[PDB]
């Protein structure tokens, strides 16, 4: 399945006024499900960093950054999440993916699973493709050995939806009730 988050670059600024005639222009990476969310997150960052509210700002550009060609890579995701008990926790995790949006979506599912952290409490600081020799965790490093091979065991190969049956003769494929 394709990643649920897209890679956005939102470019905006405070509206020029008499007190700020040539306001600074800010570039903001963010991984979001749609561009409305991406711009919402951009304005949150503008507010909490530059003290610029959305009601006094401009969106110069909001564009999806396309993913590169799909290659089995190692991804360093620098990510932070907030919880009431522990405040902000920042971690740097490694992931096997084929795109940056894939690695980031995987990181979000991972933080949701192992830390019960939801999307809006998560900030991604940096995602970066790294070489194999700079990979630190053995659970990621095992996957780039030259002779990597494994069988597929304990698999549940369900039939195609059209050919699925309720009752089947014990040692045949003869469907009885379907």
């Amino acid at each position: 399945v394709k990643p649920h988050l897209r890679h956005y670059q939102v470019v905006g600024r405070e509206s020029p006024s008499e007190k700020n005639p040539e306001p600074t222009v800010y570039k903001f990476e963010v991984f979001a499900p749609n561009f409305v969310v991406a711009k919402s997150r951009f304005w949150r960052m503008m507010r909490v960093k530059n003290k610029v509210k959305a009601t006094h700002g401009d969106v110069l550009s909001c564009k999806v950054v396309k993913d590169a060609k799909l290659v089995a890579r190692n991804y360093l995701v620098d990510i932070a999440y907030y919880s009431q008990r522990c405040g902000y926790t920042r971690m740097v995790k490694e992931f096997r993916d084929v795109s940056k949006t894939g690695a980031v979506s995987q990181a979000y599912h991972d933080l949701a699973s192992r830390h019960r952290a939801r999307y809006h409490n998560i900030e991604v600081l940096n995602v970066k493709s790294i070489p194999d020799h700079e990979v630190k965790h053995l659970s990621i490093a095992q996957y780039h050995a030259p002779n990597l091979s494994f069988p597929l065991l304990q698999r549940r190969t369900k039939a195609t939806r059209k050919d699925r049956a309720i009752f089947v003769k014990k040692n045949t494929k003869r469907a009885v009730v379907a």
Partner: protein, 220 residues
């Protein structure tokens, strides 16, 4: 056991010996709840179902977890009069029938008809052995339903530890059934082999265009 009127009327009618459309399910290594749900839905759809080998149904978890579950169920009883209380059945086929009954609208006539369409056996009794090829329920089989690292229980063992007293009888009867069936299968190997060789030579005896037709549809 038919009445004398039923036999006399059938004798008058000249009709042959009839058997309704019945599906026979081999429940060995089937997940108890999933098989029960599938069977219940098919019974509400009007199917006539006989299930065999209920003593080899499976439940996830260790045997002690599920025996303790059964004992918890067993202590439920109407204090002021245990007759008319919940009736706790110990036999595995009875357990499956109860599991299916709890998955039916048992207090309507429709649910009652559905429940009375189901026959449950331990082992495979002689009246069922020869009625036709038995079926499985793929979405309710242990080898695709349970991760094999997990412990699981066989229903007959739990039942015999909670009061079922027919475990050894069913074991001996199943051994005899398998021995008789395997003798009858080793014999008739020559008949099956004769039919296989007959089809192989029929290929060389039929017209050629028909052979090509079989080839393109994957039969030759």
């Amino acid at each position: 056991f038919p009445s004398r009127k039923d036999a006399f009327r059938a004798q008058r009618k000249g009709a042959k010996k009839h058997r309704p459309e019945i599906i026979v399910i081999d429940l060995k290594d089937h997940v108890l709840g999933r098989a029960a749900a599938v069977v219940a839905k098919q019974l509400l759809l009007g199917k006539k179902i006989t299930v065999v080998r209920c003593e080899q149904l499976n439940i996830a978890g260790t045997e002690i977890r599920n025996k303790i579950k059964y004992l918890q169920y067993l202590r439920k009883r109407k204090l002021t009069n245990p007759t008319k209380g919940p009736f706790h059945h110990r036999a595995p086929s009875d357990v499956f029938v109860r599991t299916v009954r709890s998955m039916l609208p048992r207090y309507t006539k429709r649910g009652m008809k559905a429940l009375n369409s189901l026959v449950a056996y331990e082992g495979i009794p002689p009246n069922v052995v020869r009625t036709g090829g038995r079926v499985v329920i793929p979405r309710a089989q242990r080898h695709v339903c349970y991760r094999s690292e997990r412990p699981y229980t066989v229903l007959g063992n739990m039942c015999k530890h909670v009061g079922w007293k027919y475990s050894d009888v069913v074991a001996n009867l199943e051994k005899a059934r398998v021995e008789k069936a395997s003798r009858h299968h080793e014999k008739q190997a020559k008949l099956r082999d004769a039919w296989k060789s007959a089809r192989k030579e029929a290929l060389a005896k039929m017209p050629k265009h028909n052979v090509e037709v079989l080839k393109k549809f994957g039969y030759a």
